[PDB]
Design a binder for this molecule. Structure first.
Ligand SMILES: CNc1ccccc1C(=O)O[C@H]1C[C@H](n2cnc3c(N)ncnc32)O[C@@H]1COP(=O)(O)OP(=O)(O)O
Ligand code: BEF
Ligand SMILES: [Mg+2]
Length: 743
């Protein structure tokens, strides 16, 4: 039992190291500390100041420099007793303030303990280095173990979900959120690995293997190197791991959301386009290249712009193999693989099209190589394509007349074509995989949601509003959940909004919210960003409290979200809402000779939305997701990025705290701390504090009696504590004081 084996990797990597003695006595000290900001120029940077004296109303402490300051007792961030340093659950801290919470996390992270509970949450800080805690051997130890029986780990929460599912006969969910680069995807993969192991059909698993192999496929197509993460997920996902009544994996399903189609045509400097582009061009056999008109990334417009074509310590060609390998396992026919790659090629081809002017104002294609190349790979007719691009037929009422688009318009059209192809292929890939894995007859499921938390960037656009909208919903679901769960707990022992307004501002029907207004402007071909933003301010500036019209910007607006105010820019929202593609182009592609291509334009389930707008579909999909969640027993993982540089051993208070503020961890604690944060099992209490009362012995039968003895001895303030059927409930700071009590 590595759990009992203080020499195991289990103890080494998941636990705070334990010495010989446990004796209350060791941890003894006269000093009493406080956390203070070594200056409010900061606020997240704190220092430990020893309290040198106090008044009936405040404290006076010394600083690091030796400077003596004073603080209101009522404003003081008391430091928890050293014994509390490193606890596995922040719910165990007596003093539940910000700096204190950060401090526990940091003490843990300093020992490479990246997982910590906070009440209902599992907090996970990216180590930005390898920690060998995800082995089969580590898998093995979390089997059937209670949360309180093993160290914090993603495996642990995974096991608890699996057990609850079987014991309660209730579906489960794991919501894994946080910023880009926080560790969501990695943690998601671990949940699945874990489940695959505890519930897979042993012997050697085919379905299991296919389930495992779907990720890789999806990541090649939906993941890219960004400035925040080398393997950034540019789509959100909800994976449903399906089980039969026996608790064995019976299948799975994947739901994808918000794929960043725009990255296909444009990438910021240092970033890359989707991985597959590089995989194909590196891994294609000199023979497939020829057949694909493939060259180097530098030869491609869509890949030669960012300046970055490789990922440190990443072999595209080696990855291509892995990719093709997975497609094989899942079950992509060579023929299908061919066409997917052809689509990939084609898109690269479309990007190399260079529209020219002169003649007049309308665009011309002096050179058609690229065109020819895309047409071939795609299996469409070049001339048709050609005209569909520059001379699309447009409906002027009764009139359907071809228009001669200029360069920019021609260019944008081409871009829209590429984005549609890519999004549709991605959707097709998903469905293909679901076909393989998905079971119409499942008994139970454990769903994992891997999606960004709130996004507050330099520039916030429509996709940002979407994600933040989802986030308000998940936060509200958390709050509701925390509410019942806390109530139930109090009930089993015998004890004691705002999200709506924001949600309504965005998704309301009457009065209409942001999305309803957006949709409305959507029917008007001539509407503009200016008409839209004016309408939004018209309805909400000084009229809706969660809304703010900027002092000078004419193109932005602010929303007061759970995580704070977010300023959104309205440019192109109209276009984004419609996601238009010229009919001619649809017509062109519908006639493709390619087996896969045909599906993308011919299968309405793929080729279309319903038509509803992008906003309406987003809202709908979010509502279905929440509906599903509502039916589950949920578990929450908050992934935290330690800094903005992708470095290990560098936990930045400011970076971290901001995350704790936005993600609900601190709020949760604020709330918790208001009641009876500390809840201790009778025997546990006595075991540690028996010696504080001339009366009680370590292991006593009447533990509750024994508890009251110490308390009584100590003469603790009654309203400071609460006798529960099996635990002693303590208000904030109580236990710390007691800890502070002489033997
Ligand atoms: C296949 N993997 C990649 C492929 C290409 C380049 C980098 C990576 C990528 O995974 O890079 C990773 C891996 C690393 N990481 C996260 N959690 C941990 C963990 N506990 N231990 C160690 N590292 C962690 O941090 C990066 C970001 O994690 P992530 O899970 O992709 O982030 P997100 O929250 O955006 O999904
Ligand atoms: F970049 Be991570 F997938 F949010
Ligand atoms: Mg990810």
């Amino acid at each position: 039992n590595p759990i009992h084996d203080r020499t195991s990797d289990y103890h080494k990597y998941l636990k705070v190291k334990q010495g010989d003695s446990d004796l209350f006595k060791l941890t003894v000290s006269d000093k009493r500390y406080i956390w203070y900001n070594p200056d409010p120029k900061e606020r997240d940077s704190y220092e430990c100041g020893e309290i040198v004296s106090e008044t009936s109303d405040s404290f006076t402490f010394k600083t690091s420099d030796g400077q003596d300051r004073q603080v209101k007792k009522d404003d003081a961030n008391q430091r928890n007793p050293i014994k509390f340093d490193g606890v596995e659950d922040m719910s165990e801290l007596s003093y539940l303030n910000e700096p204190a919470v950060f401090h526990n996390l940091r003490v843990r992270y300093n020992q490479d303990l990246i997982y910590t509970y906070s009440g209902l949450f599992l907090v996970a800080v990216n180590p930005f280095k390898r920690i060998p805690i995800y082995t089969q051997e580590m898998v093995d130890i979390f089997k059937g173990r209670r949360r309180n029986e093993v160290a914090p780990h993603i495996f642990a929460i995974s096991d608890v979900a699996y057990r609850s599912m079987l014991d309660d006969r209730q579906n489960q969910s794991l919501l894994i959120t946080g910023e880009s680069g926080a560790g969501k995807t990695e943690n998601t993969k671990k949940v699945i690995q874990y489940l695959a192991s505890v519930a897979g059909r042993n012997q050697a698993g085919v379905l299991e293997q296919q389930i495992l192999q779907a990720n890789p496929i999806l990541e090649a197509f939906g993941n890219a190197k960004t400035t925040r993460n080398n393997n950034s997920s540019r789509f959100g996902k909800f994976i449903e791991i399906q089980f039969n009544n026996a608790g064995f994996i019976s299948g799975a399903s994947i739901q994808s959301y918000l794929l960043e189609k725009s990255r296909v045509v444009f990438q910021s400097t240092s970033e890359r386009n989707y991985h597959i582009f590089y995989q194909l061009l590196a891994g294609a056999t000199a023979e497939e290249k020829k057949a694909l008109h493939l060259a180097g990334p530098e030869s491609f417009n869509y890949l030669n712009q960012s300046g970055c074509v490789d990922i440190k310590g990443v072999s595209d060609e080696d990855e291509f193999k892995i990719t093709r390998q997975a497609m094989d396992i899942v079950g992509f026919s060579q023929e299908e693989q061919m066409s997917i790659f052809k689509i990939i090629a084609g898109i690269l081809h479309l990007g190399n099209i260079k529209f020219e002017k002169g003649a007049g104002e309308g665009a011309v294609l002096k050179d058609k190589t690229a065109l020819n190349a895309a047409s071939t790979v795609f299996g469409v007719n070049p001339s048709v394509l050609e005209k569909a691009l520059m001379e699309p037929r447009i409906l002027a009422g009764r009139d359907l007349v071809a228009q001669h688009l200029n360069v920019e318009k021609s260019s944008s059209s081409r871009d829209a074509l590429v984005k549609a192809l890519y999004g549709r292929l991605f959707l097709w890939l998903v469905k293909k995989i679901n076909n393989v894995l998905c079971s119409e007859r499942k008994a139970y499921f454990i769903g994992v949601l891997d999606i960004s938390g709130f996004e507050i960037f330099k520039v916030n656009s429509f996709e940002q509003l979407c994600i933040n909208y989802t986030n308000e919903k998940l936060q509200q679901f958390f709050n509701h959940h925390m509410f019942k769960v806390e109530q139930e707990k109090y009930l089993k022992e015998k004890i004691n909004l705002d999200s709506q307004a924001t949600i309504d501002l965005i998704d309301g029907r009457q009065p209409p919210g942001i999305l309803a207004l957006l949709d409305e402007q959507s029917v008007f071909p001539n509407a503009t960003d200016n008409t839209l933003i004016t309408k939004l301010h018209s309805h909400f500036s000084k009229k809706n409290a969660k809304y703010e019209e900027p002092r000078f910007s004419k193109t932005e607006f602010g929303v007061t979200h759970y995580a704070g105010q977010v300023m959104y820019e309205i440019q192109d929202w109209l276009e984004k809402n419609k996601d238009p593609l010229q009919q001619d182009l649809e017509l062109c592609f519908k006639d493709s000779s390619d087996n896969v291509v045909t599906k993308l334009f011919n299968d309405p389930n793929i080729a279309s939305r319903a038509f509803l707008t992008v906003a309406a579909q987003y809202k709908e999909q979010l509502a279905s997701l929440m509906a599903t969640l509502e039916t589950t027993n949920p578990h929450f993982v908050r992934c935290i990025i330690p800094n903005n540089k992708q470095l290990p051993a560098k936990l930045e208070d400011k970076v971290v705290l901001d995350q704790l503020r936005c993600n609900g961890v601190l709020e949760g604690i604020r709330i918790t701390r208001k009641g009876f944060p500390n809840r201790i099992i009778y025997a546990d209490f006595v075991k540690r504090y028996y010696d504080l009362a001339p009366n009680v012995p370590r292991d006593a039968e009447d533990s509750q009696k024994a508890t009251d003895a110490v308390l009584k001895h100590l003469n603790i303030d009654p309203e400071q504590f609460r006798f529960g059927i099996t635990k002693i409930f303590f208000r904030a700071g109580q236990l710390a004081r007691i800890e502070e009590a002489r033997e």
